[PDB]
C-alpha cells in the first residue's frame, strides 16, 4: 500500500509530455448496430471529433506552442490533426494488438473481418499501416511522445508561418528530445545514429499515409449524399483545411530528400 500522489515531474520535455498526454477515450460504442461501413465511418468520425478536442488542449500545453501567432496555432492544428489522430491510433493498435487490429478505443476494436468488408478494406489498410511500423521498430513510449509532438510541427503553409523563427526553435527542441529518448535506451553511438535515421524516415512516411486518409476524409465529408456524419469540431476544421490542401498550400517538412 502507498499514499495517493501525483507522479514526479522532472525538468525535461519528455517528462512534461508524459503528464500532458490525454487519456485514451472510450467511444461509448453501442455494439448492437449491424455491421456496415457507413455506420462505422460515422462512429469513427464522432470519436475523432472528441479526440481532436483533446488534442487541441494538449497542444496548448506544449511549451512555446501558445507563444506562436494565433493564426499559426490554428493552421498547425488544421494541417496536423490527421497525423496526430492516425499516429495515436497506430500506438494503441501496436500496444494492444501488435498492429493486427485497429484499436480505435478500448470499446471499439475493428477486427480482421470488419476491416475486410467491401468498403472498409482499402481505408483500413491505410489506417493500420503505421501501427505495423511502430511494431516493426519496437518504438518506445518516450520515442512515441517525441515523435507525436514532431507531427504537430510537420506541416506548414507554403509561404511560412507568422512566428517562423520561434516555430523552428520549438521544432528543433523536439528533434533533440527524440535523440535523447533514443539515446536513453543505452545503445552505442552508431546504433543511435541508425535509430534516429529510422525514426525520422518513419516520420517522413506519415505524409503519404495521411494523403491516403485525407482523400477519404474529404470525399466522405463533401459528398453529403453519402450520409456519413462528422461532428461540428471536425466539420469546421475540414471545411477550412480543404481549400488549403487543394490549393497546394500544405507544405511537408521532410527530414530526408
Amino acid at each position: 500500500m502507498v499514499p495517493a500522489a501525483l507522479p514526479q515531474l522532472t525538468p525535461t520535455l519528455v517528462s512534461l509530455l508524459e503528464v500532458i498526454e490525454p487519456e485514451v477515450l472510450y467511444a461509448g460504442y453501442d455494439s448492437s448496430v449491424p455491421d456496415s461501413a457507413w455506420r462505422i465511418m460515422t462512429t469513427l468520425n464522432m470519436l475523432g471529433g472528441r479526440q481532436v478536442i483533446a488534442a487541441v488542449k494538449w497542444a496548448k500545453a506544449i511549451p512555446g506552442f501558445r507563444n506562436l501567432h494565433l493564426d499559426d496555432q490554428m493552421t498547425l492544428l488544421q494541417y496536423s490533426w490527421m497525423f496526430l489522430m492516425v499516429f495515436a491510433l497506430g500506438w494503441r493498435s501496436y500496444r494492444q494488438a501488435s498492429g493486427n487490429l485497429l484499436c480505435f478505443a478500448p470499446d471499439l476494436i475493428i477486427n480482421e473481418q470488419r476491416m475486410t468488408l467491401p468498403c472498409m478494406y482499402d481505408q483500413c489498410k491505410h489506417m493500420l499501416f503505421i501501427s505495423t511500423e511502430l511494431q516493426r521498430l519496437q518504438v518506445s513510449y518516450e520515442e512515441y511522445l517525441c515523435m507525436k509532438t514532431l507531427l504537430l510541427l510537420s506541416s506548414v503553409p507554403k509561404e511560412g508561418l507568422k512566428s517562423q523563427e520561434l516555430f523552428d526553435e520549438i521544432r528543433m527542441t523536439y528533434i533533440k528530445e527524440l535523440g535523447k529518448a533514443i539515446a536513453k535506451r543505452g545503445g552505442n553511438s552508431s546504433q543511435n545514429w541508425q535509430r534516429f535515421y529510422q525514426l525520422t524516415k518513419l516520420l517522413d512516411s506519415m505524409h503519404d499515409v495521411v494523403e491516403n486518409l485525407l482523400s477519404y476524409c474529404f470525399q466522405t465529408f463533401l459528398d453529403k449524399s453519402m450520409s456519413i456524419e462528422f461532428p461540428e469540431m471536425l466539420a469546421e476544421i475540414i471545411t477550412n483545411q480543404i481549400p488549403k490542401y487543394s490549393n497546394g498550400n500544405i507544405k511537408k517538412l521532410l527530414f530526408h530528400q
Binding site: 478536442i53 487541441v56 496555432q73 490554428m74 492544428l77 461540428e232 469540431m233 469546421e236 476544421i237 477550412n240
Partner: peptide, 10 residues
C-alpha cells in the same frame, strides 16, 4: 470561419 477551434484555443 474558425469559431470553434478559436474558442478552444482561447
Amino acid at each position: 470561419e474558425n469559431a470553434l477551434l478559436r474558442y478552444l484555443l482561447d
